[PDB]
Design a protein around this motif. Structure first.
Motif, PDB file in Angstrom:
ATOM      1  N   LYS A   1       0.906  -1.268   0.011  1.00  0.00           N
ATOM      2  CA  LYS A   1      -0.086   0.073  -0.002  1.00  0.00           C
ATOM      3  C   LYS A   1       0.694   1.191   0.029  1.00  0.00           C
ATOM      4  CE  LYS A   1      -3.531  -0.278   3.136  1.00  0.00           C
ATOM      5  NZ  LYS A   1      -4.096  -0.918   4.150  1.00  0.00           N
ATOM      6  N   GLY A   2       1.778   1.292   0.936  1.00  0.00           N
ATOM      7  CA  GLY A   2       2.756   2.488   1.110  1.00  0.00           C
ATOM      8  C   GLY A   2       4.040   2.170   1.478  1.00  0.00           C
ATOM      9  N   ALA A   3       5.088   2.246   0.681  1.00  0.00           N
ATOM     10  CA  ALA A   3       6.421   1.845   1.053  1.00  0.00           C
ATOM     11  C   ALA A   3       7.489   3.040   1.033  1.00  0.00           C
ATOM     12  CB  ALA A   3       7.061   0.858   0.411  1.00  0.00           C
ATOM     13  N   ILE A   4       6.861   4.426   1.138  1.00  0.00           N
ATOM     14  CA  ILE A   4       7.324   5.622   1.096  1.00  0.00           C
ATOM     15  C   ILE A   4       8.640   5.524   1.913  1.00  0.00           C
ATOM     16  CG2 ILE A   4       5.418   6.975   0.527  1.00  0.00           C
ATOM     17  CD1 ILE A   4       5.398   7.988   3.345  1.00  0.00           C
ATOM     18  N   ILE A   5       8.783   4.850   3.137  1.00  0.00           N
ATOM     19  CA  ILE A   5       9.943   4.759   3.923  1.00  0.00           C
ATOM     20  C   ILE A   5      11.039   3.963   3.396  1.00  0.00           C
ATOM     21  CG2 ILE A   5      10.385   3.625   6.233  1.00  0.00           C
ATOM     22  CD1 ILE A   5       7.293   4.130   7.375  1.00  0.00           C
ATOM     23  N   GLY A   6      10.811   2.839   2.760  1.00  0.00           N
ATOM     24  CA  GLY A   6      11.634   2.118   1.866  1.00  0.00           C
ATOM     25  C   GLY A   6      12.005   2.790   0.625  1.00  0.00           C
TER      26      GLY A   6
ATOM     27  N   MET B   1      14.612   1.509  -1.313  1.00  0.00           N
ATOM     28  CA  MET B   1      14.701   0.706  -2.268  1.00  0.00           C
ATOM     29  C   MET B   1      13.968  -0.848  -1.858  1.00  0.00           C
ATOM     30  SD  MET B   1      16.950   1.160  -4.666  1.00  0.00           S
ATOM     31  CE  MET B   1      18.565   0.994  -5.094  1.00  0.00           C
ATOM     32  N   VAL B   2      13.870  -1.520  -2.745  1.00  0.00           N
ATOM     33  CA  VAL B   2      12.948  -2.725  -2.441  1.00  0.00           C
ATOM     34  C   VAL B   2      13.999  -4.102  -2.627  1.00  0.00           C
ATOM     35  CG1 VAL B   2      10.633  -4.357  -2.961  1.00  0.00           C
ATOM     36  CG2 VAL B   2      10.914  -1.890  -3.179  1.00  0.00           C
TER      37      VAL B   2
END
Length: 40
Positions: A28-33, A35-36
């Motif tokens: 939903k929201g990975a703004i904190i990450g 990179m993946v």
């Protein structure tokens, strides 16, 4: 969110490409990450 393999395989990292099937879901929201792990 469907599984394809329910058991280990080998240490071969080249098989990491299998992630293409493991990435069935979408965060939903990975703004904190920044990179993946999918690419890293």
């Amino acid at each position: 969110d469907a599984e394809f393999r329910h058991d280990s395989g080998y240490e071969v990292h080249h098989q990491k490409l299998v992630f293409f099937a493991e990435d069935v879901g979408s965060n939903k929201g990975a703004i904190i990450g920044l990179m993946v792990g999918g690419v890293v």
